[PDB]
Design a binder for these strands. Structure first.
Ligand code: B7P
Ligand code: CA
Length: 426
DNA sequence: TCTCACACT
DNA sequence: AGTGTGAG
């Protein structure tokens, strides 16, 4: 079993937030520019960077003042602030523009505000039968790269792409409606169409990866960016993985990937193939070891889940440094701010998508603790009312106040989080 | 520099 | 139910 059953794509909207601001403000298009939140602290934190700006070294998580040192003509759009906090509504609404188009072509799993996986297996099958048995023209794939091609016995990027595509298509056995390579190729044609539709109907450009599973689709998408798509076939996997750092594969970018590297003494994904499955399991657990054994051979079975809507709706703000909440009524006022945005977003959700959430998650962080969350508590969510929700959130966290004073809050709070969960049909 | 999904327990 | 990981 070679992990070639499915055709799966990952589509990534290139520097999406920037694109959203560039569509709305044409003065920004085709310039180095970035999206920031909170202008006051060091010019604001950069959450999205156009490709022109990235060429100067500007990255996400940079302060805008720092990015301006690297890129003096950098243009900035600020995120909308509402009730003292960054509000992402405009981007969420652009994201829904895009997913609704993608869903006309295939079933899509929303992976984040700017990317979606796409299961094209069924769509490919139908296109294959309408195609009589007729060859696939290079003209159907005007922005597609075939990973690992050209090879064997031109100095410009587009010349390379074409030569690789020619070599791919010249050897395609179109007379076999079950070759996985043919299916990928038809998958790629559909994604060219889907990306043409997204750009025509929204003005947004994006990159896509096309392969046999989600991890490879995602890896492929990042290989030829921006506004390009890449086909990673099963056959390309041994050479692709032979120099591919372990941390580049989805879910190995963190502690597990680090311990795979250290315990095993390897650097690249393909070095995993010399270990038995039992060996991998003993070091990393039954699930992880099984997952690694198959993955380093290009095989992964995680399904594209037919889910175009988030499972949770969440509202958080950080209060770092001297800005940590120290008084009771301060903590109340911000919970109320969080509860109010949440109500706004919950009501739109109940009306657009026919469902109500039923559980409220409250999470806080205390100054001096180490981790994203210090403590997580839940309670019932019965009415979309901001005042009750914030009253309830306070109720389930007021005992964390180690201060004996009634009006003070120690240790001061460095993060407040309200999340609606456990949706049911409405 | 605010999100969202999921595995373990 | 609560914590921790991984990612955008
Ligand atoms: O830390 C983050 N903060 C943060 O707001 N977002 C938001 C803002 C951003 O446009 C969007 C994109 O996430 P991506 O990691 O996929 O990167 P892009 O900007 O779209 O460009 P590309 O995929 O490299 O071409 O999510 C992602 C984060 F990772
Ligand atoms: Ca993106």
């Amino acid at each position: 079993a070679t992990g070639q059953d499915r055709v799966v794509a990952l589509v990534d909207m290139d520097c999406f937030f920037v694109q959203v601001e560039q569509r709305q403000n044409p003065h920004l298009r085709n310039k180095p520019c970035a999206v920031v939140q909170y202008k006051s602290w060091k010019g604001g934190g950069i959450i999205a960077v156009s490709y022109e700006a990235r060429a100067f070294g500007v990255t996400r998580s940079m302060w805008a003042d720092d990015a301006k040192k690297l890129c003096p003509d950098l243009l900035l759009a600020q995120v909308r602030e509402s009730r003292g906090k960054a509000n992402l509504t405009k981007y969420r609404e652009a994201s829904v523009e895009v997913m609704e188009i993608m869903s006309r072509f295939a079933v899509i799993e929303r992976a984040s505000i700017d990317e979606a996986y796409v299961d094209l297996t069924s769509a490919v099958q139908e296109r294959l039968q309408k195609l009589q048995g007729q060859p696939i023209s290079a003209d159907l794939l005007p922005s597609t790269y075939i990973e690992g091609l050209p090879q064997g016995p031109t100095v410009q990027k587009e010349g390379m792409r074409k030569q690789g595509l020619f070599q791919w298509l010249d050897s395609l056995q179109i007379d076999n409606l079950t070759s996985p390579d043919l299916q990928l190729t038809v998958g790629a044609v559909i994604v060219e169409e889907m990306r043409a539709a997204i750009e025509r109907e929204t003005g947004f450009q994006c990159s896509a990866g096309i392969s046999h599973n989600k991890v490879l689709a995602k890896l492929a998408c990042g290989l030829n960016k921006p506004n390009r798509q890449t086909l990673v076939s099963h056959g390309s996997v041994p050479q692709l993985f032979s120099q591919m750092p372990i941390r580049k594969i989805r879910s190995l970018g963190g502690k597990l990937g680090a311990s795979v590297i250290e315990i095993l003494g390897i650097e690249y994904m393909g070095e995993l193939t010399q270990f038995t499955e039992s060996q991998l399991q003993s070091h990393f657990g039954e699930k992880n070891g099984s997952w690694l054994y198959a993955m380093c051979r290009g095989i992964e079975h995680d399904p594209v889940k037919p889910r175009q809507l988030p499972k949770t709706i969440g509202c958080s703000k950080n209060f770092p440094g001297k800005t940590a909440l120290a008084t009771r009524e301060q903590v109340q006022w911000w919970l109320l701010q969080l509860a109010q945005e949440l109500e706004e977003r919950l009501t739109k959700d109940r009306n657009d998508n026919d469902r109500v959430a039923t559980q409220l998650v409250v999470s806080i962080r205390v100054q001096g603790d180490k981790r994203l969350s210090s403590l997580r508590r839940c309670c019932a969510l019965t009415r979309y009312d901001a005042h009750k929700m914030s009253h309830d959130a306070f109720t389930v966290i007021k005992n964390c106040n180690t201060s004996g004073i009634q009006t003070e809050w120690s240790p001061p709070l460095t993060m407040l989080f309200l999340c609606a969960t456990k949706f049911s049909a409405s």
